Design a protein around this ligand. Structure first.
Ligand SMILES: [Mg+2]
Ligand SMILES: [Mg+2]
Ligand SMILES: [Mg+2]
Length: 289
């Protein structure tokens, strides 16, 4: 088996301080992480584990890489995020008995595992006070038909409806506040469960269908940057042919390396921006993968 886990560098203002935890099971100093519970995706598991271990709520930002090691059960795979504390404070729990807030240099010395230190080096390499654009490929929606129009009305299938419900907690982990969808039923439907959770309208985006993208790709780019520039953390749901065109373009101009790549239905690209520049592009699997 591969056990799936998630962790973070939890940080707050003043340079910046990060949280290092102490665990009595091993008498060690490390970054918060834990295992995914049933039906959870990594971002959710990170936020939960940060709250359980540290007492802090937080909003995830840039992904900071992956750590993999053997365990009795097989292999543990831990994905890490940068996480801005949004409040709270620590008190001892069974897993974690002490927590210290340390500037990065002092954290680096406090952390006993080389793999943690590597994560913290990734954290400091780029800005961490970022805003976030969440580009989502619509969920599964059955078969393309022979009628012209790119099936404007074709709905999510059962699996896709489930993928949409699963996205809510995942997108909320990144502080999603505003909703945008290409002018296709299946794109809207994929973020309607989030819309219900936030109680918010979805802005329709005819410039971001595959049709419009091909006819005027420059209009789509311009619109994406417009959406990105507004306050808040926008969710933009679009189609398969649009996404790589836009992401690959934006990564190449910003000199951003995506550590993973894909484009499955119900996947999310977490785009981190600092000062309006892209500093990260993180591909997340569909929640039922
Ligand atoms: Mg833990
Ligand atoms: Mg834990
Ligand atoms: Mg746990």
């Amino acid at each position: 088996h591969t056990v799936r886990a998630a962790g973070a560098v939890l940080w707050r203002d003043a340079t910046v301080e990060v949280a290092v935890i102490h665990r009595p099971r091993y008498d060690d100093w490390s970054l918060p992480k834990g295992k995914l519970d049933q039906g959870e995706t990594e971002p959710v598991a990170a936020a939960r584990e940060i709250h359980e271990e540290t007492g802090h709520t937080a909003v995830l930002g840039r992904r900071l890489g992956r750590v993999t090691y053997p365990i009795p059960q097989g292999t543990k795979r831990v994905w890490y995020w940068a996480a801005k504390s949004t409040g709270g404070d620590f008190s001892p729990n069974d897993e974690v008995d002490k927590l210290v807030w340390l500037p990065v240099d002092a954290a680096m010395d406090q952390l006993q595992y080389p793999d943690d230190r590597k994560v913290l080096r990734r954290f400091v390499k780029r800005p961490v006070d970022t805003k976030t654009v969440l580009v989502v490929r619509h969920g599964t929606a059955g078969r393309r038909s022979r009628y012209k129009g790119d099936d404007r009305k074709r709905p999510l299938d059962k699996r896709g409806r489930a993928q949409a419900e699963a996205l809510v907690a995942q997108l909320m982990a990144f502080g999603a506040t505003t909703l945008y969808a290409a002018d296709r039923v299946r794109c809207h439907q994929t973020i309607e469960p989030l819309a219900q959770e936030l109680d918010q309208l979805i802005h329709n985006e005819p410039l971001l269908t595959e049709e419009a993208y091909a006819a005027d790709h420059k209009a789509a780019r311009k619109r994406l940057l417009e959406i990105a520039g507004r306050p808040g953390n926008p969710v933009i749901c679009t189609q398969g042919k649009v996404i790589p065109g836009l992401i690959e373009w934006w990564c190449e101009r910003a000199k951003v390396r995506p550590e993973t790549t894909g484009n499955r239905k119900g996947s999310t690209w977490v785009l981190s921006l600092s000062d309006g520049e892209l500093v990260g592009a993180d591909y997340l699997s569909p929640p039922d993968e």
